[PDB]
């Protein structure tokens, strides 16, 4: 996994690759790592897949409760607190490494959140096995107050760096762009890897597989 | 990490480096390790990032509620006590080396160390974190009784610059804060602003 986030002039750009592994085998080629938290907050997930899925879902759900009650748009600091306090409670046994980004009444905010419950509030972050590749791109090229298309280029370049240099990362690049006026959930943003074209025909004709037993059970 | 705090007549100076590490990767180069617990009480954090953040958030809550109940600014010794209680009780489950420093109207400028294990001791000045090993000598030779605020800031930036030079686990920018009756003054020494001392190349 490579996930990443950037604060630009008018918002956040989040990014992620789409590979999921079981050991050193790819289980899923097009898995979605950018999670809905609220309409104005998203969260990229790296680490134990079930933990990132169940952790983001639970917090999103509690924020919907929260915002249902307050009648207000939720804040990024609230998502950050809820996540970090839960992760801290579980002492690192919930293996969720998160890039939390959104826009609220106090502007754009971006946090990285670690399995043990520490968080860092920063203008660019990366997480996952490809995070040093992605971070190298950010240190080389990030400037403050980038325009939207610059920020999107930079994030997709950072994910690509992870995709190609980390055996843990692969397949597509997904982005999410969040501003005061807009949410663009771009899945896929880029498809830099394509399965090679199938050269031979293996046309297995009917009867090729021998059958011992058959039962037809009709339905209505 | 290197952290430091110094008492002067009327206030305190606090300082930290800005490095967060996992193994020898730098997860944050510009970390802010000087966290506000109240209007005029800060803690400097070393050790586990998760632990010191969680503990600092909990003490902030405890102290804020205490302070509304009493309807008075909190004592620095009370902030230190709350840190001590939590760090001592959970010493087997926490990795946290804390300096609490600030100002209150009763005792003025104060610095308290709560090192790992959760003892508490008041000091003229305190240092902590991995990098502090490399500056015991320096601060022992340099510290003078009666330093002004500006002298305490200079002393602090020097000491941290030296530790940061030698400790792989410290580095980045120096963050300073001065706390007195009049409020909190924060600043960053970065790049060429960080005190410089020659590598001792050969004649």
């Amino acid at each position: 996994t490579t996930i990443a986030g950037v604060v630009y002039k008018d918002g956040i750009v989040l990014g992620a690759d789409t590979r999921a592994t079981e050991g050193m085998v790819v289980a899923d080629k097009n898995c979605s790592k950018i999670h809905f938290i609220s309409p104005n907050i998203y969260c990229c997930g790296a680490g134990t897949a079930a933990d990132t899925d169940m952790t983001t879902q639970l917090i999103s759900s509690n924020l919907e409760l929260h915002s249902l009650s307050t009648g207000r748009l939720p804040r990024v600091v609230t998502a950050n607190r809820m996540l970090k306090q839960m992760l801290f409670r579980y002492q690192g046994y919930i293996g969720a490494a998160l890039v939390l980004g959104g826009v609220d009444v106090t502007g754009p905010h971006l946090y990285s959140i670690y399995p043990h419950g520490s968080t860092d509030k920063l203008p660019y972050v990366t997480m996952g096995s490809g995070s040093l590749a992605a971070m190298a791109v950010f240190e080389d090229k990030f400037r403050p107050d980038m325009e939207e298309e610059e920020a999107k280029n930079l994030v997709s370049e950072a994910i690509a760096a992870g995709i190609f240099n980390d055996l843990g990362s692969g397949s597509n690049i997904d982005l999410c762009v969040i501003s005061k006026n807009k949410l663009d959930f771009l899945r896929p943003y880029t498809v830099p890897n394509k399965k090679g074209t199938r050269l031979g025909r293996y046309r297995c004709e009917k009867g090729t597989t021998a059958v011992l037993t058959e039962k037809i059970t009709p339905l209505e | 990490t290197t952290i430091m705090a110094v008492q002067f007549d009327g206030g305190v100076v606090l300082g930290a480096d800005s490095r967060t590490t996992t193994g020898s990767y730098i997860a944050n180069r510009v970390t802010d390790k000087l966290t506000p617990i109240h209007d005029r009480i800060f803690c400097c954090r070393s050790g586990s990032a998760a632990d010191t953040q969680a503990v600092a958030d909990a003490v902030t809550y405890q102290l804020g509620f205490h302070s509304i109940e009493l309807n008075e600014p909190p004592l620095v010794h009370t902030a230190a006590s709350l840190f001590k209680e939590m760090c001592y009780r959970y010493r087997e489950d926490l990795m946290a080396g804390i300096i609490i420093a600030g100002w209150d109207p009763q005792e003025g400028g104060q610095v308290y160390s709560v090192p790992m294990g959760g003892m508490m001791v008041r000091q003229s000045f305190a240092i902590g974190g991995s990098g502090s090993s490399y500056i015991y000598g320096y601060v022992d030779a340099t510290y003078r009784e009666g330093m002004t605020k500006e002298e305490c800031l200079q002393f602090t930036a020097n000491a941290l610059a030296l530790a940061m030079e030698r400790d792989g686990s410290s580095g980045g920018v120096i963050r300073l804060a001065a706390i007195a009756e009049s409020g909190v003054e924060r600043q960053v020494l970065l790049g060429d602003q960080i005190p410089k001392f020659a590598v001792a190349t050969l004649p």
């Binding site: 670690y114 | 967060t20 996992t22 997860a27 070393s46 586990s48 974190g129």
Partner: peptide, 4 residues
Amino acid sequence: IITX
């Protein structure tokens, strides 16, 4: 883990 992650330290200061």
